[PDB]
């Protein structure tokens, strides 16, 4: 199944297996991402920061590689990884990498 994730108009596509590999994340948990399902367009819609998403998605494709894009403020991106609930063990690697 191809999944279409629509972030403020920018559509990202990925395979269901890819998201499911991190089952305790907003996107990896059907009960969580479904709260965001758009029945009308058959895609999940997020009214959020666009540039932060390449990184949220690569996190799943890469097997857990969490890198903030150079042009996304520390605070914007941190709010985003928190919302997508990427997990304590990655918020940590993220913290070590950033300075705190």
Question: Domain 1-100 belongs to what topology?
Answer: Potassium Channel Kv1.1; Chain A (3.30.710)
Longest dimension (CA), the chain: 43
Question: 57 — phi, psi (to 5°)?
Answer: -70, -40
Boundaries of every domain in the chain: 1-100
How was this structure obtained?
A: X-ray
What resolution does the deposited structure have, in angstroms?
Answer: 2.5
| Ordered DSSP codes for 10-76 | EEEEEEHHHHHTSTTSTTT-HHHHGGGEETTTTEEEE-S-STTHHHHHHHHHTTS-----TTS-HHH
């Amino acid at each position: 199944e191809r999944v279409v994730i629509n972030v403020s108009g920018l559509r990202f596509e990925t395979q269901l297996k890819t998201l499911n590999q991190f089952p305790d994340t907003l996107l990896g948990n059907p009960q969580k991402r479904n709260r965001y399902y758009d029945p009308l367009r058959n895609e999940y819609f997020f009214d959020r920061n666009r540039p932060s998403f390449d990184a949220i998605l690569y996190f799943y494709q890469s097997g857990g590689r969490l890198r903030r894009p150079v042009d996304v403020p520390l605070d914007v991106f941190s709010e985003e990884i928190k919302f997508y609930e990427l997990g304590e063990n990655a918020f940590e690697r993220y913290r070590e990498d950033e300075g705190f």
